Design an enzyme around this catalytic site. Sequence first.
Site: not given
Length: 290
Positions: A139, A26-27, A28-30, A45
Site C-alpha cells: 500500500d 493528531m490529524g 483510530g484514537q491517537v 495510540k
Amino acid sequence: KQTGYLTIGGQRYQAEINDLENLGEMGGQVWKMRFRKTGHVIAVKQMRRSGNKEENKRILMDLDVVLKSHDCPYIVQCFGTFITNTDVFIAMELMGTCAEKLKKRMQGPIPERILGKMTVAIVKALYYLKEKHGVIHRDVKPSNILLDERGQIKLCDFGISGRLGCAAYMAPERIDPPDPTKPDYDIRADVWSLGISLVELATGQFPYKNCKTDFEVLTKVLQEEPPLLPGHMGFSGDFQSFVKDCLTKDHRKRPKYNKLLEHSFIKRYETLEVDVASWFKDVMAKTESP
Ligand SMILES: C=CC(=O)N1CCC[C@@H](n2nc(-c3ccc(Oc4ccccc4)cc3)c3c(N)ncnc32)C1
C-alpha cells in the site's frame, strides 16, 4: 497501574501520567503528548480491549513489525507500551505530516531535491521490510510517507505489516489477475506504486485525476503509456529515468528494490546535502493544515 516506561534516544525513562502533557488529536484514537522529562513530543495510540477485532488485529500486527524494526532508520519507532486491564497504550515517534498532506499544503509540486531524499528513505524502508521481515507492504502511497521538522523521512506504521480500493496506485499485473484469492504478486507491484507516488508528488497532479470512477483509472493503467515525468518542469535525467524504470508496465522487466538502490538517482541523493528540515519548517509556517 501508575508507572510505564519510555525508551527514547537510547535511554529508558519511568513515565507516570503527570510526566505527559496531552496536546490533543493528531490529524483510530491517537494523541500528541509532550514528555516533560525530555521535551519530546510523541504520539500515543489507544487500543481498547473492547475494540473492533479487525482493527485491533491490524494494530497488533503493525506493532509487531515496528518493535522488530528498531534497526531501520526509515521506519517510525515505538518508544513503549503500557497495558492496563481495559486498554493498551502505544507510544510512537511523532512525525510532522505525510506526503499527501504536504502536497495539499504545497498546492502543487514538491521539489525534486526533497523527493530524492524521500525516495532513498522509502525504498530502503520497503527493502528492509521485505528482506528482514518478509513483508510485502502492498500500500505504497503518499499518505504512508512521513516527514518531520528534523528532516527525517520515514514509512508510516499504519499497514506496515502488509495485507494480514486504491486502483489509483495499482500496478497493471494486479488489475485482472488469474487468482485474486491467491494474489501471488511480489514487491514489483509496490515499485509501480512508488513510481506513481513520485509522479503525483513531483507534478502536484495524480496521474489519473481526470478519471471519474475507479474502473476508469484501471482502464488507464492498462491502456495508456506509463505516466512518466513531464519534460517542462526541469526534472533531472536521473529522476526521469528512475520513475521510468519504476513504471515499467511489464512487471517481468520492472526492477526490484535491490536494483533500484543501485540507480544513479538514489546514489546522487545519498550524497547530496539537502536541508529537508529547514524546507519542511518553512512550508509548515507558510501554510494552513488540511
Ligand atoms: C493525559 C492523557 C490521558 O490521561 N488521556 C488521554 C489519552 C487516553 C487516556 N489515557 N492515556 C493514558 C496514557 C497511558 C500511557 C501513556 O504513555 C505511555 C507511557 C509508557 C509507555 C507507553 C505509553 C500516555 C497516556 C491512560 C492511562 N494510563 N489510563 C487511562 N486512560 C489513559 C486519557
